Amino acid sequence: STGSATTTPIDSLDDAYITPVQIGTPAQTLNLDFDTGSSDLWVFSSETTASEVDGQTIYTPSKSTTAKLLSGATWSISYGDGSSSSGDVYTDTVSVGGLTVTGQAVESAKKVSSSFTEDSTIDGLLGLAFSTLNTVSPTQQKTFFDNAKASLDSPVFTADLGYHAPGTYNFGFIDTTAYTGSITYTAVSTKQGFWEWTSTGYAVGSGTFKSTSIDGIADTGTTLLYLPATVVSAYWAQVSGAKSSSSVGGYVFPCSATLPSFTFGVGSARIVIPGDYIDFGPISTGSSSCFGGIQSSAGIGINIFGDVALKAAFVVFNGATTPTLGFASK
C-alpha cells in the first residue's frame, strides 16, 4: 500500500504545516501537524476542556462506530518550546492520503497548553519519530508509520515541504519526479528515538564549505534551523546589523537586509537553503527588525534540522531495519 497527502503552511511564515487526516467511521477529518520529532498522534476532541478549545476541529469518538476506548491508557507530552498536552486514548481507523491503519492509537486531549489553544488551525499532532518515544502508559503505542510499515510497498515516508506553498507527505514510495539529481542517504541513530543523523558541515552564502560533524535531528515539527552557536554566529556575522536579542529570544536582523543562503552537508552532497527561507519577517507587525530562521541550539541540547532546512530538500525517512535519511535537492 501507499498514501499521499498534501501538507499546507498554517500561515504566511510557514510556522507549521497541517495535513488532513481521516479518523473514525464515518470519517472525521482533522488537520494535524506531522511531527518527525515526536511519536504521539493526539487530537483535540470532545473531551478537551472547553475553555482550551478555540476554533479547532474536534474528534468525537462517540460518533465513530470503529472507536474503542483503550481502557486505562493515558498520555502526557511536552514539546521543546514548553507546550504540552495530555489525556486518554482510543483506538480507531486512521487514514492519511488513502493509506489506512486500523486500530491506531488516537490520543484524545483532555488538556492542552496555551500555544495549542491559540493555534486554531492545528487540530492535533501526528508523530513520526520512533515509537520508543510514545508517551502512552502503561502500554506504549506505535506511531501511524510504525503501524503502517509492514503493509507499505517500501518501509519509508517522504517529506516534501513547500516554501510559502503546499507540499506533500508520501508513505510507502519515493516519487522520483519530486526531486532533482540523486538522493544522498545518511545513517540514522535511533538511540534517542529521533531521526538523528550527522551533517558533514556547512557554508554561508558563496563561502567555502567548512567540513565539521554536526549531529542533529530531522524534525518536521520544528519551524526553524537550530545549530551550534559557532555556526549560527558565522552565518549572522555576514548580515549587517544582525544581532542576538535577549528580549526577542534569538537572532534578529534588519528587515532591509538581503540574507545569504546557507548550505548544509549530507555526506558528500550539499543542500542549499535560499536566503529567503531564513527570513521570518518582522518580529511584530510594522517592525523593521526581522526574525532569523537560523538560531542557536545552545540550551536546547540538540541540533534541529527543522522546517527551514527540510523545506529546501526532498527528504526520505527510511524506516527499514537499518534506518537512514535521504536528502535530495529539488
Binding residues (CB under 6 A) for ligand IIZ: these are: 13, 15-16, 33, 35, 37-38, 79-81, 83, 115-116, 119, 122, 125, 219, 221-224, 280, 291, 300-302, 304
Q: Give the DSSP letter of residue 214.
A: E
Question: Shortest approach of ligand IIZ to residue 84 CB, angstroms?
Answer: 9
Question: Shortest approach of ligand IIZ to residue 299 CB, angstroms?
Answer: 8
- Please identify, using beta-carbon distances, which residue of 33 and 107 lies nearer to ligand IIZ: 33
d(Cα 3, Cα 126) in Å, to the nearest integer? 15
Question: Shortest approach of ligand IIZ to residue 211 CB, angstroms?
Answer: 26
- Please identify, using beta-carbon distances, which residue of 160 and 279 lies nearer to ligand IIZ: 279
d(Cα 230, Cα 26) in Å, to the nearest integer? 52
- Please identify, using beta-carbon distances, which residue of 125 and 309 lies nearer to ligand IIZ: 125
Catalytic hit among 35, 146, 160, 307 = 35
d(Cα 195, Cα 92) in Å, to the nearest integer? 26
- Please identify, using beta-carbon distances, which residue of 135 and 222 lies nearer to ligand IIZ: 222
The three cell numbers of residue 154 are 517500501
52 close to 87: Cβ distance less than 8 angstroms = no
Question: Shortest approach of ligand IIZ to residue 69 CB, angstroms?
Answer: 26
Q: Which residues of 266-289 are buried (b: 16+ CB within 10 A; e: fewer)?
A: beebbbebebebbbbeebeeeeeb
- Please identify, using beta-carbon distances, which residue of 120 and 182 lies nearer to ligand IIZ: 120
Question: Shortest approach of ligand IIZ to residue 17 CB, angstroms?
Answer: 10
Question: Shortest approach of ligand IIZ to residue 66 CB, angstroms?
Answer: 27
14 close to 164: Cβ distance less than 8 angstroms = yes
Of 246, 297, 249, 292, the residue nearest 273 (C-alpha): 292
Report the largest interatomic distance among the alpha carbons of the chain, rounded to a whole angstrom.
60
Vertex 220 angle, CA 218 and 221, to 5°: 120
Q: How many CB atoms lie within 10 A of CB 92?
A: 25
- Please identify, using beta-carbon distances, which residue of 16 and 89 lies nearer to ligand IIZ: 16
Catalytic hit among 108, 199, 261, 296 = 199
Q: How many CB atoms lie within 10 A of CB 86?
A: 17
Active site residue 76: no
Question: Shortest approach of ligand IIZ to residue 25 CB, angstroms?
Answer: 28
71 close to 135: Cβ distance less than 8 angstroms = no
Task: Give the up-direction half-sphere exposure of residue 226: CA atoms within 13 A in the CB hemisphere.
Answer: 21
Q: How many CB atoms lie within 10 A of CB 320?
A: 11
d(Cα 223, Cα 228) in Å, to the nearest integer? 17
Cα-Cα-Cα-Cα dihedral sign, residues 323, 171, 195, 183 = positive
Active site residue 35: yes
- Please identify, using beta-carbon distances, which residue of 224 and 316 lies nearer to ligand IIZ: 224
Q: Which residues participate in catalysis according to the annotation?
A: 35, 199
